[PDB]
């Protein structure tokens, strides 16, 4: 037998006895005792038994000579034992230590610190000393085992149920104890060739295991090597159930099975940290549990932001390595993180599954601030709950086809060559992503620009196709720090794939979906913008199809030369298509190629450009939707537009099209809408070379604050099948409120045509130039002006109304109604012309104007000019009414006209009326009434041909000043063979009554001349006159 020898008690109190060669008994009296030994050896079959007053009592055995402590037999105590040997300690096979706590250390402790319960172990070791545990070291529940040495090796089994196991290589280790247990351990100080190796079984169920190795050198040598089994099952301790700490040097190599599972509760937390962490082929860090998973951190916390975990410089996880934080029955998946600052090599399998009977999938991060190689397998699916997320995070990510990337792991790979990267760029296998989408795991890819001077920028480049042929609905998000160049398609043949190709919150790059890289979601959404963050990320799409199926499409971006630029032959199919963007110099939305946008419900185009256009559609853009809305703003340019000398813009909205902006210039367009409407707010609107047909009402509103016209229609065909066409132009400068030119046809046979033009100053209201053909049930023209004219028809126009035609307006200095060109106003029922002027005329008909109707009504007022003026020496005015014609105003002058009427009557109230060089034939009466308050004549006829086929001719002139009440001159013929001719002339002062000059032939059944005068002649016959009557001729007056 071989028991310790040379024992001497140096502090505290207790006796040493050896009752048998095979049994030693150390009896402790004090709470803390320290004894020195010449050698502390225990032979096979021998026992050293401590007898301490309590489980909290501590016996220190300091070896002061001999060699290493050969412990081969059984060592037992009811309290804590601290063994210190500067020559290291060896526990052989079959040895057993059972105490209330046990510490083995090659570092010495001072008697003053031990006796005063200050358990600090530092220095004094022999170089190369090691503690090797080949036996079974156990404690009572709540105890602890600490092995402190330059080299620590565990080949046997260590058990500290409910307590702590600490294996550490450092210059100083401080143990903070309280009431019999271990509260904390402070491990500090690098040593030369530090190594902590675990080959056997370490178990601390419901406790903690700490493995710490602090090396001074070991550039690429192993400092922490775990090849056996570490068990720390139980509750989720927030400080970590298993903690591996490789220090600030060397490589940590784990080949055994870290575990912290909880069969009935939540899984625990396993933290593996060090400079270089290598997970070998058979490793399986597992932190699972019954009611939900735990957490596994390798090299860092989530995204490296957890301040309590040292970030690794390199993490390599070889193929075959498995990390599982999945839930096993019911509960959410846990968190797994692979983090490195320089290089992450991920080829293994990480699970974070939800429970089979409930719970959501967990989250797995595989990332590196530097070079991330993500080729392995991640599974964070759920059987009943939500899909989990696989997060990738690296400087610049490139997606490649397959795994054939000359990876290094087990073939042609000498130990530790895996930490020398050659695969520049964060290559990601497309197979892994596709496998994640098919297995119910979402994928989120992030990048981030590094310091100025490097190449990596966050440019996510897709060089391999992504597809989702199977599995439940998952999301795919690619949020780059730099560019989102997509060179391959992203498709889905099953489930919903939600694609989010957003930019980083502060990104300043571009998103390009180049070379036939069509995106199809099979019902998921396509988002290539942000939402509300003002992230100046532009979108450039070339020859790409975006097919959302029954999902939504939303594109946003802001740039300088373009916001969202489309080129090539693009196609967009969705339930909702929303394109929003911004620019400063160029076009916010710029569609230059051929594009088909086919929405089931709505299409919305929104944008803003300070100096350019908001929405610019020049290529062959075809937009089909239930509702199409085009809205935008521009200060110096256009809001909307469809201009292009070769392209045609086709819009098809089954319910309504509404367009808004500062200026909308529609053109070479073909627009079909239910209720079509425009609202231009700053520089008017223009419809040129287009065809616009609507089932229901068309409402075109525009305001112009500059030289351009408000509602400008050129070569446009506007039709309303069952509704009305209403235009409302406003001009605040000198442009025209409403302006028609070219070949324009307006058809509202089932509705109304209402054109409004409100101008200001010299601006005119509604101008009709060229050739304007308007057909409707009801036609109405309304307008206002100040110095210009309100309604001015100068070209050729045809108006065909199935009921009435109404022309109304007001012009302060111009004419209210002005017809100087050639026109045929044809109405089935009534034509009414009403307006007002101050200096100009109310109605001025100058060109060849034919008005045909059942009833024609002409009315207006002019303060200084004429009320009704039908005069020109070149043109002829033709009127054709079936029923009554009434002409009422301050002054009515009719010259060079041919009027056919049922009844006809004049009512002049201020300056009388004149008919000259005209033919007027009525079936019934021609009652001409006129009052004059000036020197002008009341009723004056010059070279007039007036005939009543079946009626009478009546005139009643009044002269309140000194003008002629009634006056005839020229060649006048009055024919009333079926009636009476009655002329009344009531003058005042020096004025005469009825004056007959020239040659006046009056033919009637009865003729009567009645009048009154004061100083003048009541009847004054100065020329030639013949009065032919079949019965009586009466001449009376005073």
């Amino acid at each position, epitope marked *: 037998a071989n028991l310790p020898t040379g024992g001497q008690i140096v502090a505290g109190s207790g006796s040493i006895q050896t009752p048998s060669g095979n049994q030693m008994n150390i009896h402790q009296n004090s709470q803390n005792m320290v004894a020195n030994w010449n050698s502390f050896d225990i032979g096979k079959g021998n026992t050293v038994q401590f007898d301490q007053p309590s489980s909290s009592a501590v016996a220190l055995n300091r070896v002061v000579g001999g060699g290493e402590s050969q412990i081969m037999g059984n060592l037992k105590a009811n309290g804590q034992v601290f063994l210190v040997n500067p020559n290291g300690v060896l526990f052989g096979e079959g040895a057993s230590v059972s105490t209330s706590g046990f510490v083995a250390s090659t570092r010495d402790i001072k008697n003053d610190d031990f006796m005063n319960r200050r358990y600090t172990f530092s220095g004094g070791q022999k170089a190369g000393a090691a503690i090797v545990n*080949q036996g079974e070291l156990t404690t009572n529940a709540g105890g602890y085992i600490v092995l402190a040495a330059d080299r620590v090796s565990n080949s046997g089994t260590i058990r500290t149920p409910g307590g702590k196991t600490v294996l550490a290589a450092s210059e100083r280790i401080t143990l903070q104890l309280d009431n019999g247990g271990l509260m904390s351990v402070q491990v500090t100080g690098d040593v030369v060739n530090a190594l902590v190796e675990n080959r056997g079984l370490v178990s601390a169920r419901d406790g903690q295991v700490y493995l710490t190795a602090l090396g001074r050198g070991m550039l690429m040598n192993t400092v922490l090597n775990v090849s056996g089994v570490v068990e720390a099952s139980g509750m989720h301790r927030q400080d970590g159930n298993i903690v591996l700490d490789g220090g600030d040097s060397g490589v940590v190599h784990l080949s055994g099975t870290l575990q912290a599972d909880n069969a009935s509760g939540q899984g625990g937390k396993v933290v593996v940290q060090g400079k270089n962490i290598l997970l070998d082929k058979g490793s*399986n860090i597992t932190a699972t549990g019954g009611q939900g998973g735990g957490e596994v951190y390798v090299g860092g916390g989530w995204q490296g932001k957890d301040s309590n975990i040292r970030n690794a410089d390199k993490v390599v996880m070889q193929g075959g390595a498995r990390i599982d934080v999945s839930a096993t*029955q019911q509960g959410n998946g846990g968190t797994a993180v692979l983090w490195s600052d320089s290089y992450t090599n991920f080829h293994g399998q990480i699970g974070a599954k939800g429970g089979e*009977t409930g719970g959501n999938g967990g989250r797995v991060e595989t990332s590196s601030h530097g070079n991330l190689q993500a080729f392995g397998t991640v599974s964070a699916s759920a059987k009943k709950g939500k899909a989990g997320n696989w997060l990738l995070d690296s400087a610049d990510i490139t997606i490649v086809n397959g795994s054939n990337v000359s990876k290094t792991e087990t073939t042609q790979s000498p130990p530790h060559t895996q930490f020398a990267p050659t695969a520049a760029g964060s290559a990601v296998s497309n197979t892994s992503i596709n496998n994640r989408l098919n297995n119910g795991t979402s994928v989120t890819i992030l990048t981030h620009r590094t310091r100025t001077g490097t190449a990596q920028g966050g440019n996510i480049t897709v060089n391999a196709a992504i597809n989702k042929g199977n599995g439940s609905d998952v999301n795919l998000t690619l949020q780059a720090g730099g560019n989102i160049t997509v060179n391959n398609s992203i498709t889905s043949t099953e489930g919903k794939l939600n694609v989010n190709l957003s930019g980083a919150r502060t990104s300043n790059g571009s998103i390009t979906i180049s070379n036939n890289a069509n995106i199809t979601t099979n019902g998921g959404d396509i988002t290539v913008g942000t939402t509300n963050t003002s992230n100046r990320v532009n979108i450039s799409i070339n020859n790409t199809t975006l097919n959302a199926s029954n999902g939504n499409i939303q594109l946003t971006g802001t740039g300088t030369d373009s916001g969202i630029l489309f080129a090539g032959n693009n196609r967009l199919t969705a339930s909702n298509i929303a394109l929003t963007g911004n620019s400063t110099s160029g076009n916010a939305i710029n569609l230059t190629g051929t594009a088909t946008l086919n929405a089931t419900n709505n299409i919305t185009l929104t944008g803003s450009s300070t100096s350019g256009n908001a929405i610019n559609l020049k290529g062959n853009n075809t937009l089909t939707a239930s509702n199409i809305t085009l809205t935008g703003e521009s200060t110096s340019g256009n809001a909307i537009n469809h201009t292009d000398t070769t392209g045609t813009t086709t819009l098809n909205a089954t319910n309504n099209i509404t367009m808004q902006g500062t200026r909308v210039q529609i053109k070479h367009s073909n627009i079909t809408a239910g209720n079509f409407a425009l609202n231009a707010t700053v520089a008017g609107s223009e419809i040129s070379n287009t065809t616009l047909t609507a089932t229901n009402n068309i409402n075109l509103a525009a305001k112009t604050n500059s030289a351009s016209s408000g509602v400008y229609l050129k070569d446009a065909r506007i039709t309303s099948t069952n509704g009305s066409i209403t235009a409302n132009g406003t001009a605040t400068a000198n442009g025209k409120a409403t302006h028609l030119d070219g070949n324009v046809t307006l058809n509202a046979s089932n509705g109304r045509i209402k054109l409004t033009g409100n101008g200001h100053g010299s601006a005119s209201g509604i101008l009709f130039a060229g050739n304007n053909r308007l057909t409707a049930s009801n036609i109405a023209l309304t307008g206002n002006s100040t110095s210009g004219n309100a309604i001015n028809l100068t070209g050729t126009a045809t108006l065909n109304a199935t009921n009435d035609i109404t022309l109304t307006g007001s012009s302060t200095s111009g004419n209210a109604i002005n017809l100087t060109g050639t026109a045929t106003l044809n109405a089935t029922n009534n034509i009414t012309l009403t307006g007002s002027s101050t200096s100009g005329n109310a109605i001025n008909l100058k060109g060849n104007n034919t008005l045909t109707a059942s009833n024609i009504t002409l009315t207006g007022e002019s303060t200084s000019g004429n009320a009704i003026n039908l005069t020109d020496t070149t043109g002829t005015t033709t009127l054709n009414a079936t029923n009554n014609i009434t002409m009422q105003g301050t002054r009515v002058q009719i010259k060079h006209s041919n009027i056919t009427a049922g009844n006809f009557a004049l009512n002049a109230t201020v300056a009388g009326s004149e008919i000259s060089n005209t033919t007027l034939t009525a079936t019934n009466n021609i009652n001409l009434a006129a009052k004059t308050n000036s020197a002008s004549s009341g009723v004056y006829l010059k070279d007039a041909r007036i005939t009543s086929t079946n009626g009478s001719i009546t005139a009643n002139g009044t002269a309140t000043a000194n003008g002629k009440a009634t006056h005839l001159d020229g060649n006048v013929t009055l024919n009333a063979s079926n009636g009476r001719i009655k002329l009344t002339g009531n003058g005042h002062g020096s004025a005469s009554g009825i004056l007959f000059a020239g040659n006046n032939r009056l033919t009637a059944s009865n003729i009567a001349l009645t009048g009154n005068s004061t100083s003048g002649n009541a009847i004054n016959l100065t020329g030639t006159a013949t009065l032919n009557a079949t019965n009586d001729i009466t001449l009376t007056g005073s």
Partner: antibody
Amino acid sequence: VQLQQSGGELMKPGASVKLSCKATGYTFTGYWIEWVEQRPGHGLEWIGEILPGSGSTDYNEKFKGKATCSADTSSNTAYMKLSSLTTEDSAIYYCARKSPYAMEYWGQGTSVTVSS
Amino acid sequence: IQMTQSPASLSVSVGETVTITCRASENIYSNLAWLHQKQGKSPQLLVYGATNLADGVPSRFSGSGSGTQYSLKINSLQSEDFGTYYCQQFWGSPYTFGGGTKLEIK
């Protein structure tokens, strides 16, 4: 990782045997080597477990006393002794490396036949 | 803890997906492994920890189950998949085994 086993044996009733299962390609002391009996009409039954490093063992209650498990860590091989074998103890005995989850890499098994 | 599995023997077609079930006499917290013993070979591990497959096992095998009721689903069964499958629990000391199920060619 490989777990080769000794070949079969023919034994007389009442004899004891000590079998063999070489462990290679992994840390021998870090995994448990579990011995399982396979018989026609019974399939597989667990026999016992040894942790070669510390020498800790665990046995099926029906096999206590009859079987003893041990290991030589220096030679990286696993031994099992079966005492007082009878006719009804003829079986194929497998050794396997067991990690916390699943007795992986089973060996080929030793056919132990007991007859007069 | 007793383990029962069924069917004891299944006659299946090549290319058919089949299910093997296993029931524990006590609640086993997912610590159920499945072994595959090809005729003439020692049993190999296919799925460990109820659902996690072992490396080298084709994706056609899928484990499932919880509580006391577990099963193994074999998609598009191939010729190499015939033989005897076993379930075993590590939640009890006797790491008991089921009686095994055999797949034979129909």
